[PDB]
Amino acid sequence: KVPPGPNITTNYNGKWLTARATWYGQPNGAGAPDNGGACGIKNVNLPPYSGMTACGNVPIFKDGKGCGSCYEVRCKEKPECSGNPVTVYITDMNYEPIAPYHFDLSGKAFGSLAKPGLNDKIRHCGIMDVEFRRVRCKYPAGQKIVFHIEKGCNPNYLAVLVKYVADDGDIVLMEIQDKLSAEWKPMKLSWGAIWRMDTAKALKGPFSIRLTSESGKKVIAKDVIPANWRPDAVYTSNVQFY
Numbered sequence: 123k124v125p126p127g128p129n130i131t132t133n134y135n136g137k138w139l140t141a142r143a144t145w146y147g148q149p150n151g152a153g154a155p156d157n158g159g160a161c162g163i164k165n166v167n168l169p170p171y172s173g174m175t176a177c178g179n180v181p182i183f184k185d186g187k188g189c190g191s192c193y194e195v196r197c198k199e200k201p202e203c204s205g206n207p208v209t210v211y212i213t214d215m216n217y218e219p220i221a222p223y224h225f226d227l228s229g230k231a232f233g234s235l236a237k238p239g240l241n242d243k244i245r246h247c248g249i250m251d252v253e254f255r256r257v258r259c260k261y262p263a264g265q266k267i268v269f270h271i272e273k274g275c276n277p278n279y280l281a282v283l284v285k286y287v288a289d290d291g292d293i294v295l296m297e298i299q300d301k302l303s304a305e306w307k308p309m310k311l312s313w314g315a316i317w318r319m320d321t322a323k324a325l326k327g328p329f330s331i332r333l334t335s336e337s338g339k340k341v342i343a344k345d346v347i348p349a350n351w352r353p354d355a356v357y358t359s360n361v362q363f364y
């Protein structure tokens with residue numbers, strides 16, 4: 123049995139750590155056959171993620187609190203290795219105790235670690251020792267944080283997904299407050315980047331949401347939730363982590 127890392131914090135100490143990488147799914151896909159993952163963010167194949175997805179064990183993944191993080195991995199062991207790093211997003215998980223730190227890259231990502239034209243070649247080594255370090259996350263400019271409403275059930279129990287969180291990348295607490303009776307009530311971490319609000323009878327009127335990065339940093343989106351909100355509906359805010 124192989125014991126996990128630790129466990130990576132928001133301590134951005136720009137230096138490389140060892141880890142074993144492998145890939146899963148299609149060779150030119152974004153990992154999950156459905157292009158989604160343990161985090162609950164979907165379309166990880168399309169931009170911005172654009173298939174540069176990956177999986178990590180407890181240390182990296184952190185039971186869903188690492189969802190959003192960005193890491194930089196590079197290969198310099200076996201040939202055909204670009205030598206240069208690729209910026210990966212953590213949108214899924216894999217807890218197999220095969221090594222202290224483990225990354226399970228997409229075919230796209232795993233390939234990107236290779237010198238131009240050697241992709242598919244390098245993808246057939248399956249497992250190799252890579253090097254990495256977490257990094258703040260950068261998205262296209264102007265790209266703010268987006269909240270997606272999930273498929274409901276019992277009369278309004280909500281559940282919001284949060285994507286495109288720059289810098290820390292990952293969330294560790296969400297909370298609300300409707301029009302009147304402010305005080306920011308927490309939220310349940312249903313799973314991954316999905317947060318749940320059991321009660322919803324009282325909570326009425328454009329809601330404000332406060333996110334707290336792994337670091338403690340916080341932000342506030344006033345509306346982003348009218349009232350005529352319907353599951354699947356998507357809201358974009360004017361707030362982000364710098």
Ligand SMILES: *[C@@H]1O[C@H](CO)[C@@H](O[C@@H]2O[C@H](CO)[C@@H](O[C@H]3O[C@H](CO[C@H]4O[C@H](CO)[C@@H](O)[C@H](O)[C@@H]4O)[C@@H](O)[C@H](O[C@H]4O[C@H](CO)[C@@H](O)[C@H](O)[C@@H]4O)[C@@H]3O[C@H]3OC[C@@H](O)[C@H](O)[C@H]3O)[C@H](O)[C@H]2NC(C)=O)[C@H](O[C@H]2O[C@@H](C)[C@@H](O)[C@@H](O)[C@@H]2O)[C@H]1NC(C)=O
Binds near residue numbers: 311
């Ligand atoms: C490396 O990162 C990992 C990834 O998170 C860290 O390890 C996780 O740390 C969590 C600490 O919050 C642990 O807590 C969960 O498990 C607790 C133990 O529960 C016993 O009974 C429950 C029954 O429900 C079983 O499931 C468990 O298996 C266990 O046998 C559990 O009590 C706790 O929930 C309770 O406390 C929280 C506040 O801590 C509270 O909000 C809850 O309402 C409840 O009162 C918690 O359960 C969670 O899982 C499901 C989520 O939906 C819930 O919201 C959440 O409560 C995790 O077990 C643990 N994960 C692993 C290692 O598999 C780790 O921080 C470490 O954390 C410390 C506290 C200790 O658990 C270490 O062993 C653990 O490695 C980090 N490394 C380190 C060392 O920092």
